[PDB]
Design a protein around this ligand. Sequence first.
Ligand SMILES: COC(=O)COc1cccc(COC(=O)c2cn[nH]c2)c1
Ligand SMILES: COC(=O)COc1cccc(COC(=O)c2cn[nH]c2)c1
Lengths: 212, 213
Amino acid sequence: SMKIDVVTIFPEYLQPVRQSLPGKAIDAGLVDVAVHDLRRWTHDVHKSVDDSPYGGGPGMVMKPTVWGDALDEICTSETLLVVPTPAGYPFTQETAWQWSTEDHLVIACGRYEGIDQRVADDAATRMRVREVSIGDYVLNGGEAAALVIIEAVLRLVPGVLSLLEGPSYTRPPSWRGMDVPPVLLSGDHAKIAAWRAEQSRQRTIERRPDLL
Amino acid sequence: SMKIDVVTIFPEYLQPVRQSLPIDAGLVDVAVHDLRRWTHDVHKSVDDSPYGGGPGMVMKPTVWGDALDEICTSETLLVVPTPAGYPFTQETAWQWSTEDHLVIACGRYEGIDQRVADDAATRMRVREVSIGDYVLNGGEAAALVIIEAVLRLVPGVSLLEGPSYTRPPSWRGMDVPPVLLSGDHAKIAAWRAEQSRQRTIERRPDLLGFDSP
Ligand SMILES: COC(=O)COc1cccc(COC(=O)c2cn[nH]c2)c1
Ligand SMILES: COC(=O)COc1cccc(COC(=O)c2cn[nH]c2)c1
């Protein structure tokens, strides 16, 4: 049973996952995903969420006063506050497993140059805060990363949704001049396992030598 | 100018392309295609059990082949998100940012029949890529990540970044580091350099050539 709150200036972006949820898991009270528009907590008529960085430079920084108010309302001491950022600790499958047993995740989607650092610093004095990167590239905002995180975590929550894996094949046995490797149709399951292991080894060497 | 086609059995999940990415400026067109449009069955069965055994289902090559025949040309870069792919990094995003035509094929279940990629590679460039070391249910979220990463680099649109600050200079008894308020560019550049190095060592030692925790 997990509650996920997402805070973003683009709430419509998160509507796919809101619809990716089986009705059964919602009605069983296994999962709830709520999305909140950050501008609800702006306090000027122009609904400002960012401002120029101290120390100069191009880019805008999201205002601590706005985020502070939002997190104050949404978070509790039990919350795991997740902040996607290219400067974060690596988000991996191990991370997803760990977070899959959390009761309350709040994902704070930043944009532009990022969120004023005091927001996370302040939050960290009364809840668990995790700045995480989903990969070594740069996006415009945290929303796509939030989708990845939500999907990776929730698919590990029962009933809600190393080497590289080798190739897989299904019907038909012959297609556009290409046959399924005959070993897979051999009925020798020890030999099939060894073939797949070697395929995995070769693919890992070729594509991800870092994993060795 | 760039064209992006995404092919998926869940085209509704790709609606978030029309939010912060834009298209509206006409520098790029993005189209989403329902893979089931290329089935001939009354049940539209896109998957079956894997040869050689194993859990789950594999997407049949027949439906993908027909779809890609219609959508791709020899100039197409066929992108296939997969946890078993080459790593997609910022370098990749730069490389793809000058392409005319990306087609992103989103898999589901336990994957796509290997022959789809093998067949496509006889006529176009194919890139199987991972966006990170975690497992998703399907390629669609990875497609969105790839699209975002690439589009912000399209003409007409290391270390970890350290902390950023903005007004007010004091908040909840927390002050902006005084050097940032000082207007001294050399001292500010140096402080920021030191913060980034400190953050990179702590969070991503691998980037500086050290063992990971
Ligand atoms: C204190 O927290 C923050 O400042 C975070 O704010 C930002 C700043 C820049 C970019 C993003 C979006 O996340 C990614 O691009 C990302 C995640 N993983 N890999 C790339 C978010
Ligand atoms: C030949 O290509 C395929 O078989 C594609 O198959 C699948 C199957 C399930 C899920 C996905 C989506 O990719 C990721 O989860 C992913 C990407 N990066 N890191 C994780 C793709």
